[PDB]
Nucleic acid binder design. Structure first.
Ligand SMILES: [Zn+2]
Ligand SMILES: [Zn+2]
Lengths: 149, 50, 400, 127, 107, 237, 99, 764
RNA sequence: ACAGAG
DNA sequence: TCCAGCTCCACTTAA
DNA sequence: TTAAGTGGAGCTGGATGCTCTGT
């Protein structure tokens, strides 16, 4: 687990020093830079991710778990803890993704889709309970909060 | 709302009291801030900020 | 890696081919042999081979708790009956062993008495596992419980009771035992050898490696119910035994619309009759511009519907044959609007051509493979009779 | 404990000791022969159909390779699972209908396994 | 330790006899007198760790430093990025900022 | 805010769900405890070892069964070097007193303390659905007795702060017994809290449980970037 | 949303209709940007598809350049004429007398 | 020195799609059904006999299906096209005719063509009228050449039997319980009986649970009932390590507390726990012989080969309690796909046994009672039991089969004809097993085991996100194989029998087990020679090329999977850092000398399974090849499916955008086929002036999308204009909509029937 | 009962 | 698929 | 010796997001 934290340290320095190197050489009257400075749509993570480097593809707060025996895909060696074998993309969305990097980024995207889909039945029953328990309370004219009874 | 094939509902109130409880209490000019933390919700959006 | 040591001869004996068994004990380690314990009864059934033994354990040793032995002997036996009895004395004296049958066929196992420099095999008639029995506790519970108190098509083969009644009909065969320390165990041990010369050439085992491989891996189907006449594109690289060779040219030329001459020798190999076969090949392919071209009758007989979408069209093979004739006289088909002269669709002509050629700008199509030599094979006369026959084909075209 | 191999098996029984040893070897399902006038079909040929006499030779090659040349084809000999329980090789003879002799010939220690060399059988005529 | 009867191969139990303690079978007369010291050592795993943690270097072995937070602008920082909610088409970040030990944690 | 969001802790929707369900057992309970002498870690490991559950097998270097011609027993040799390094208040006489607590009903006459490290446990007849060969039961059950600390605390840990002007050592305890962790010698019991509102209600009263509900809902809402005015969670509590 | 693929589809289409090709957009491959940037300069357009654009309301030129090209839009089955709905008072259920 | 690249490698994909993949899956299952399995069902039910009055019997000999016909008013029959069955609202079926041999006193009376029912014939199968025709002969059948088929026509609607995803039967699953305890289970499914057995460690001792036993009995009593009585042999079979024996000890100590020491005692104990449906001994012995672990065979009550198997289960529970290596339900080596043939086999077997039972009941009524004249059962062969069963179970979609306890619902769906991709995208759908029981988040995720088998991007959005899935472009599903030569080869490669050994060899560090679909073939030393020799015998052609072999080095087992319904994918064999496929081979493929099976036989292309690509190393491209590579990927764009194959440059987008395109692309207005004017459907959307895409994927060329497209090329300026385009709204051109852009057509339907009543009156 | 849409 | 009430059963104190 | 009050274990019954749009 010490190795995991150091690899995530060395890999996430690459995204910062790659993203702070593209934002220094963008001219003004760039359109994503204008749309990110005025906060209307986007950010600096998105510009630095579709120009410089798509970062570590993380699933459940960690690197990509092994789907096969002791490796993520058959395309890598067993027990390899390299960046490319556990979900570090090096390309941007400009230069396009390789097959393994595309598959890992799709793995990281389906978690967002499934959390959005599960979120709905996850929360609505809670709000139904809160409303059924709290709907009676009122602020009276004598500055107190009383129930119906 | 996001204008990507979005359906919204409508209700015409059928009583004068149902009008006046909807205008004074439920109008957009009287609901600019959210009741959660007092922050404004009706404000500018993309291409009105840019 | 030459056989640096021990070119060891391997023999075979048959004098014990139907007497030799193999008793193995799953619960007893290799150190604690039964060589010392005396034996009492040896029982067997020869068909449905099942062995029961009885071994006599002592009592004067310190490892026999006589207080428990008296109680277990009182439990199994009666108190004073002794007419028929499991144990003879007032103690547990014997231990009975029961067998279980390992396999159905022992045809492939062999015991090997390795002498110096040679090795003697002998087949096994059976392989039996002997385990210690616990039937005396069941007999003790039996003595303890007796002291206290137009039919349908049936399945009797798959019942335990009918199976036991099938096994009860065989009478027992009692046997004398002879231990390992007997001289008979040394006397009968020499029958695992065979009387034979050091060098004998074997009459059997003459089969070849490919026959042995075909014998241990037999072909799935001895003959198939339908016969493949091969209109479907079966494996051209597989020299199918039941297909004639000429039909493998017919299906190949239907696949490979044009091919070089030398590939026939490269695909068949020089063992074919590569001189007489041209009276077969002349009926299915004809040589044009140094190469073979498929004949018309292989692709479409005169009732075939259009093979493409758009406006349907009828087959007209001389509308193909005139095109391949034009490649025989000219360098190529070289002009823009041959589809008006021959009246048929452009979608026919430009699709037919697309299986033999590639387009260059304005000047039609390019012949896909270089001008090899016609005169590689010895035949002089065909060089002129080909012109006679294509003159006949031209005269056929001249009717329409 | 380490796991011995067939060349170390036959060396200790030959060079180290003159004393004979009973082995227990398995064969392939068919032996590469014709059943000699056995009224057949190309069925299985086993040891129950052959005759007495020399059946083949055993070649221990350099670097541990052990083959069983059993005619024109050479089989392959490998040490099987090593048993460590008791095994006894007995002769049961039914000299009479109701009685007979039982005799123990010795203890069997090692188990050998024979198998056809499918790579060499297949490299004669590839498919 | 498991010890098994040479006769029938059931499991032995320890009991006491008139001269010694004995291993005895439950189903046959076999007994084995314990004449001398016999032992079986387990050797279990000791509690190897002491595990002090929470050091500041154990906190800041993450990439980010010298960036800008919208609250206190300090360089010594600890960032985080998420994307695992595709209802949020915008990105997701969270930041920690601890140069002056101010300790903000916002979006 | 539940639609926006979802030592390990649970945050997001399951944390708010565990708060408002007010169940008696939450997933991952955490007791945060303050120390009075928060200067150096030599004092912190003492009170760490006073509350964390330590098994007998974790300090014994071997546990052997000895069969003799006159008696059979089970011998446990303590590894006193590890007792020295873990800074624990255990020896042979304390292990003798930690045994005879809910184990097979052994008698105090059955357990001896022959050295300072060796402890022999002579067994007797269980006499209730067991054979006197119950030595095998204590062969695998006696290493799981507790000798020191609180039986409900799974683990405890030392956590140090971030400030440059100071360095104080708190004590994040993963357990479900607030009353015990408050009451040990060396833990500042006036400033220690919990996450489980049921323990805070049972120990410190209904008003402290109200304060705990307020603090915990506001903490879970802050950690996912949300922001609720405190009057709403005040009304909920 | 980071659809750089649409931004390359536009450029590949504009470079494809000016010389009569179909540039491939195959997964993990396809025609690169460095090749379609050379087909647009050769036909007189800018090498990044941005064009000098005059506003049609005022007649003055726009300051920024605008990115023109053919993009393959597909029409979906969701039309508003099949979804506009209203009810003053109408038929009701029989069990619960509500609409 | 750079590794040379074969540039025409992609050609292996258009040569593959002529034969396998892309609804050829459904067709190769339905042809398999109507060619062999309807003969295996008749063989299992070949003779029926009335219980009263013997010496009378009906005997089936052969069964056929034949060509589709329609029965009309004046008993005129005629062959029919599928479009005529689309219009007139009838079903599209061919009559099942069986030949019989029955007794009317004269003991041998035979028949040859006795029609007993009507089988719905799937389109483009081996008995449809459409197969093997030219495109200009699809014209007189009013049928599109590009219609994929694979669907039925039942009462006019087009229903598709979807691909069902199951768990692999007959396999030990070692899993953690809700309580944290580690147990085992195997759903022992055979043809006649399905049942789940368990292995629970609820008190530190091992129990075994079953639906026939009212209380889960300890495991040593089961071993004593199964013929092994010494406890030493039980501990030999479980394991001879120290900690294994220490973990297993309290189950021997439990069995010695009771007085069970003999097999008769154990059978007496187990017999008095049986839920009652000779009692004590025999109802326990038969229960252990045919219900607990029913896929393991006992022949003559020799329980050795079942004792070895339950010892393997107990050893895996013990060794999984040490380190938490529990098996996952999500690795697709443990999934099996069930096509239309394997469902219609079960349906027809149930309907056919109900047919024989109804006829036997009629014969039992009419023989003892009525008349001395010898009746025939030919006069009671009412066809409407088979036809109504098949039509109702296809048209409605519920599969209530009492014989197999299957109660699936929602199997068939209506084939969607919104566009062309919608019709082709439905024919590759895989429904899941759970089907939205709860928000699982375990199978809804994307496992890495779906590499190249299932599409990473194509999935619905919403409650079915990650549960409805779609096949890749280059995948294949095996059928059930023969099992002839596999056992005969395996018993020559040094596999020792399991009967010639005690259990102690299972704890040796050099002895692996060889399984075959859940049954034990024995043990082996030096497993790598076995695996290499088996793969060479597969590459030569002696073993069928869909038989995969694998190795699990942790559990020390060598699996051989010959079963059907599991995923395959082709690859290129790489030997000593060079591929087996050369440029000369691909030129010979392009010129027509060879086809794809010629690549199969010459050991150039082999199929890999999901369990076998666990053991191999695969390079994506040729420049990734190092010394430990065994296979080369043919085409990496085959990773994406069919609906994702429309996306131009899909590897530059963010990943949810491709999913939203896989959803929206099915709903695009377009064209259906060449018969879209002769076709009368419920709701058909067309576009007036469609155009083919200007930027296209090779998948578009493969599925022939641009012969009938969906969409128009719009000249798009990307700018901020007029402020009505804020959140995803887009401004159009008024003078472009007038000239024809976006012009669609909407076709609807209105049908009316005019029936004749039983009373002689009629609508008018 | 199934598929969609937000 | 997860979780509060209800009921059954051993386990000490106390006479 | 046993009457009795209270722990712990198994069984039982309850619940699991909002709408339209079609077959
Ligand atoms: Zn014994
Ligand atoms: Zn801050």
């Amino acid at each position: 687990e010490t190795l995991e934290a150091l690899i995530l340290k060395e890999l996430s320095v690459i995204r910062d020093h790659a993203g702070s190197a593209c934002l220094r050489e963008l001219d003004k009257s760039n359109s994503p830079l204008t749309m990110a400075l005025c906060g209307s749509k986007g950010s600096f993570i998105n510009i630095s991710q579709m120009i410089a480097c798509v970062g570590q593809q993380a699933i459940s707060g960690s690197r990509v778990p092994d789907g096969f025996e002791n490796r993520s895909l058959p395309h890598f060696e067993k027990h390899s803890k390299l960046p490319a074998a556990k979900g570090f993309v090096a390309n941007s969305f400009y230069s396009g993704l390789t097959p393994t990097e595309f598959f890992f980024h799709t793995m990281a995207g389906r978690e967002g889709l499934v959390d959005t889909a599960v979120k709905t039945a996850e929360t609505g029953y809670m709000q139904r309970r809160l409303v059924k328990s709290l709907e009676d309370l009122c602020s009276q004219y004598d500055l107190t909060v009383r129930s119906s009874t | 709302a996001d204008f990507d094939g979005d359906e919204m509902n409508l209700h015409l109130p059928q009583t004068e009291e149902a009008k006046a409880e909807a205008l004074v209490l439920m109008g957009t000019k009287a609901n600019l801030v959210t009741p959660r933390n007092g922050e404004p919700l009706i404000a500018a959006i993309q291409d009105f900020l840019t | 890696d030459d056989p640096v040591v021990q070119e060891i001869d391997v023999y075979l004996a048959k004098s014990l081919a139907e007497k030799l068994y193999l008793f193995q004990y799953p619960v007893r380690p290799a150190s604690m042999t039964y060589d010392d314990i005396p034996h009492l009864s040896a029982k067997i059934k020869p068909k449905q081979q099942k062995v029961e033994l009885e071994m006599a354990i002592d009592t004067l040793n310190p490892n026999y708790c006589r207080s428990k032995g008296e109680q277990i002997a009182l439990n199994v036996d009666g108190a004073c009956a002794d007419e028929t009895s499991t144990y003879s004395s007032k103690l547990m004296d014997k231990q009975t062993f029961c067998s279980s049958q390992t396999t159905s066929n022992t045809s492939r196992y062999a015991a090997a008495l390795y002498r110096q420099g040679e090795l003697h095999l002998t087949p096994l008639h059976g392989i039996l596992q002997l385990r210690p029995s616990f039937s005396y506790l069941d007999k003790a519970d039996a003595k303890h419980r007796e002291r206290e108190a137009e039919q349908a098509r049936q399945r009797r083969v798959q019942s335990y009771e009918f199976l036991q009644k099938k096994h009860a009909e065989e009478p027992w065969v009692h046997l004398h035992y002879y231990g390992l320390r007997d001289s008979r165990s040394e006397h009968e041990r020499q029958y695992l050898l065979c009387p034979g010369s050091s060098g004998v050439e074997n009459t059997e085992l003459v089969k070849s490696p490919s026959e042995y491989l075909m014998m241990l891996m037999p072909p799935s189907q001895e003959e198939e119910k339908d016969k493949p006449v091969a209109p479907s594109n079966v494996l051209s690289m597989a020299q199918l035994r039941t297909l004639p060779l000429a039909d493998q040219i017919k299906i190949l030329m239907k696949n490979v619309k044009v091919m070089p001459f030398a590939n026939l020798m490269s695909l068949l190999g020089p063992s074919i009759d590569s001189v007489a076969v041209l009276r077969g090949i002349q009926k299915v392919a004809m040589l044009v511009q140094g190469n073979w071209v498929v004949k018309s009758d292989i692709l479409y007989p005169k009732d075939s519907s259009s093979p493409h979408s758009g406006v349907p069209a009828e087959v007209l093979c001389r509308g193909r044959d005139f095109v391949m004739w034009k490649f025989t006289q000219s360098r190529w088909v070289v002009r823009k609007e041959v589809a008006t002269v021959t009246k048929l669709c452009a979608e026919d002509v430009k699709d037919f051509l697309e299986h033999m050629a590639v387009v260059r700008i304005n000047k039609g199509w390019e012949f896909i493979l270089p001008y090899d030599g016609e005169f590689i094979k010895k035949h002089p006369d065909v060089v002129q009779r080909q012109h006679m026959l294509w003159t006949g084909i031209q005269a056929k075209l001249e009717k329409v | 404990l380490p796991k011995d191999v067939s060349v170390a098996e036959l060396l200790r029984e030959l060079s180290l000791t003159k004393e004979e040893e009973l082995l227990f070897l398995q064969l392939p399902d068919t032996l590469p022969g014709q059943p000699p006038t056995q009224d057949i079909a190309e069925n299985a040929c086993t040891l129950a159909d052959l005759t007495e006499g020399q059946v083949g030779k055993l070649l221990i090659r350099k670097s541990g390779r052990v083959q069983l040349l059993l005619g024109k084809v050479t089989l392959d000999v490998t040490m099987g699972t090593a048993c460590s329980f008791l095994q006894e090789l007995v002769s049961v003879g039914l000299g009479d209908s109701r009685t007979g002799e039982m005799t123990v010939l010795g203890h069997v220690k090692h188990k050998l396994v024979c198998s056809p060399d499918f790579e060499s059988l297949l490299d004669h005529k590839h498919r | 330790m498991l010890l098994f009867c040479p006769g029938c191969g059931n499991g032995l139990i320890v009991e006491e006899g008139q001269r010694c303690h004995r291993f005895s079978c439950n189903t046959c007369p076999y007994v084995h007198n314990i004449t001398r010291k016999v032992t079986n050592r387990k050797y279990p795993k000791l509690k190897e760790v002491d595990d002090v943690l929470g050091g500041a270097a154990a906190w800041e072995n993450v990439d980010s430093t010298a960036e800008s937070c919208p609250k206190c602008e300090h360089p010594r920082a600890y960032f985080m990025q998420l994307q695992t909610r595709s209802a949020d088409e915008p990105m997701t970040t969270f930041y920690k900022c601890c140069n002056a030990q101010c300790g903000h944690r916002w979006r | 805010p539940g639609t926006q969001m979802t030592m390990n802790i649970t945050l997001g929707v399951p944390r708010i769900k565990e708060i408002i369900n007010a169940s008696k057992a939450i997933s991952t309970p955490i007791i945060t405890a303050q120390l009075d002498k928060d200067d150096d870690a030599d004092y912190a490991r003492l009170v760490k070892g006073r509350i964390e559950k330590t098994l007998l097998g974790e300090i014994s270097e071997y546990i052997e069964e000895v069969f003799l011609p006159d008696d059979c027993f089970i011998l446990v040799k303590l590894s006193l070097e590890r007792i020295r390094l873990l800074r624990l208040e255990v020896n042979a006489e304390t292990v003798r007193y930690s045994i005879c607590t809910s184990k097979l009903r052994v008698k105090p006459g059955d357990v001896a303390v022959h050295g300072e490290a060796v402890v022999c446990v002579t067994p007797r007849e269980n006499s209730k659905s067991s054979m006197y060969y119950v030595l095998q039961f204590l062969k695998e059950d006696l290493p799981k007795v507790v000798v020191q600390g609180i039986p409900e605390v799974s683990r405890a840990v030392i956590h140090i702060d971030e400030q440059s002007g100071k360095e104080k050592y708190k004590l994040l305890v993963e357990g479900d017994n607030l009353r015990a962790v408050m009451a040990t010698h060396g833990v500042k019991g006036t400033r220690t809290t919990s996450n489980n509102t049921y323990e805070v209600e049972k120990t410190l009263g209904i008003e402290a449980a109200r304060t705990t509900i307020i603090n915990e809902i506001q903490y879970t809402m802050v950690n996912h970037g949300m922001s609720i005015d405190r009057r709403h969670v005040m009304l909920l509590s | 949303r980071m659809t750089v693929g649409k931004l390359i589809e536009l450029l590949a289409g504009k470079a494809g209709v000016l010389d009569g090709r179909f540039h491939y957009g195959t997964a993990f491959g396809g025609s690169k940007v460095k090749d379609v940037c050379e087909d647009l300069v050769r036909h007189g357009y800018n090498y990044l598809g941005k064009d000098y654009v005059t506003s049609g309301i005022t007649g003055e030129p726009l300051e920024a350049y605008i990115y023109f090209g053919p993009v393959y839009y597909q029409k979906l089955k969701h039309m508003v004429l099949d979804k506009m709905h209203a009810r003053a008072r109408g038929p009701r259920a029989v069990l619960t007398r509500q609409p | 020195a750079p590794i040379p690249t074969v540039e025409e490698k992609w050609r292996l994909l258009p040569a593959f799609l002529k034969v396998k993949g892309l609804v050829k899956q459904h067709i190769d299952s339905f042809n398999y059904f109507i060619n062999v399995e309807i003969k295996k069902i008749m063989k299992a039910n070949e003779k029926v006999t009335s219980d009263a009055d013997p010496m009378w019997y009906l005997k089936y000999l052969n069964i056929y299906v034949g060509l589709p016909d329609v029965e009309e008013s004046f008993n005129v029959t005629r062959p029919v096209s599928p479009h005529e069955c689309r219009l007139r609202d009838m079903t599209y079926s061919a009559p099942i005719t069986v030949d019989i041999e029955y007794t009317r006193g004269s003991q041998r009376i035979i028949r040859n063509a006795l029609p007993i029912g009507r089988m719905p014939i799937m389109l483009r199968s081996s008995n449809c009228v459409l197969t093997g025709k030219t495109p200009a002969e699809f014209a007189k059948l009013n049928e599109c050449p590009l219609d994929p088929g694979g669907y039925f026509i039942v009462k006019g609607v087009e229903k598709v039997i979807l691909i069902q995803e199951q768990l692999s039967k007959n396999r030990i699953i070692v899993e953690a319980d809700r309580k944290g305890a580690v147990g085992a289970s195997v759903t022992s499914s055979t043809h006649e009986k399905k049942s789940r057995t368990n292995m629970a460690v609820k008190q530190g001792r091992f129990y075994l649970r079953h639906n026939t036993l009212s209380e889960d009995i300890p495991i040593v009593i089961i071993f004593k009932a199964m013929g092994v009585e010494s406890d030493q042999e039980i501990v030999q079979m479980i394991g001879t390590e120290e900690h294994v024996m220490a973990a297993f000890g309290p189950s021997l100590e439990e069995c010695q507390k009771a007085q069970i020491f003999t097999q008769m005692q154990a059978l007496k104990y187990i017999g008095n726990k049986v839920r009652r449906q000779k009692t004590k001994i025999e109802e326990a012995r038969e229960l252990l012989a045919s219900t607990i672990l029913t896929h393991v065979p006992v022949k003559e009550f020799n329980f050795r080969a079942k004792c070895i198997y339950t010892a393997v289960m107990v050893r895996r529970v013990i060794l999984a309690q040490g380190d938490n290596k529990v098996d996952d339900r999500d690795y697709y080596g443990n999934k099996r796909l069930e096509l239309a043939g394997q469902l219609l086999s079960l349906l027809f077997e149930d309907l056919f046994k109900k047919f024989n039972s109804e006829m036997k009941k009629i014969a039992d009524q009419v023989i003892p009672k009525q008349r001395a004249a010898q009746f025939d059962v030919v006069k009671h062969m009412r066809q409407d039991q088979i036809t109504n069963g098949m039509v109702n179970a296809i048209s409605t979609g519920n599969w209530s089969l009492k014989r197999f306890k299957m109660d699936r619902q929602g199997v068939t769906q209506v084939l969607s004809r919104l566009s062309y991709i919608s019709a082709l995208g439905m024919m590759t759908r895989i429904s899941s097993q759970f089907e939205k029981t709860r928000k699982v988040s375990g199978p809804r995720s994307l496992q890495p085991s779906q590499w190249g088998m299932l599409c990473p991007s194509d999935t619905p959005e919403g409650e079915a996100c990650g549960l409805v899935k779609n096949l890749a472009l280059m995948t294949h599903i095996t059928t059930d194989m023969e099992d002839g030569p596999i056992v005969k080869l395996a018993s020559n490669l040094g596999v020792e029998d399991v009967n010639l050994l005690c259990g102690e060899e299972l704890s040796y560090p050099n002895v692996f087990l060889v399984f075959l679909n859940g049954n034990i073939l024995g043990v082996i030393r030096d497993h790598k020679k076995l695996v290499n020799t088996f793969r060479l015998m597969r590459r030569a052609g002696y073993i069928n090329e869909f038989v995969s072999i694998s190795t699990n080095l942790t559990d020390r087992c060598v699996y051989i999977s010959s079963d059907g319904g599991r995923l395959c994918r082709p690859y290129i064999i790489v030997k000593k850092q060079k591929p087996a496929v050369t440029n000369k081979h691909m030129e010979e493929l392009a010129q027509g000398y060879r086809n794809f099976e010629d690549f199969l036989h010459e050991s150039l292309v082999e199929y890999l399974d999901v369990n076998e690509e666990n053991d191999c190393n695969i390079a994506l491209y040729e420049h990734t090849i190092n010394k430990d590579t065994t296979h080369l990927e043919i085409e990496p764009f085959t990773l994406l499916g069919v609906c994702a194959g429309l996306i131009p440059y899909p590897h530059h987008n963010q990943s949810p955008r491709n999913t939203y395109q896989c959803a929206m692309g099915k709903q695009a207005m377009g064209t259906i086929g060449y018969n879209q004017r002769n076709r009368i459907d419920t709701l058909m959307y067309l576009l007036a002036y469609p155009q083919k895409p200007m930027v296209k994927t090779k998948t578009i060329e493969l599925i022939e999308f641009e012969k009938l497209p969906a969409g128009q090329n719009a000249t798009v300026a990307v700018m901020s204009y007029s402020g009505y385009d804020i959140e995803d709204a887009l401004v159009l051109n008024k003078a472009s909509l007038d000239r024809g852009f976006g012009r669609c057509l909407v076709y609807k339907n209105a049908k009316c029937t005019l029936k004749r009543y039983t009373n002689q009156t009629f609508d008018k």
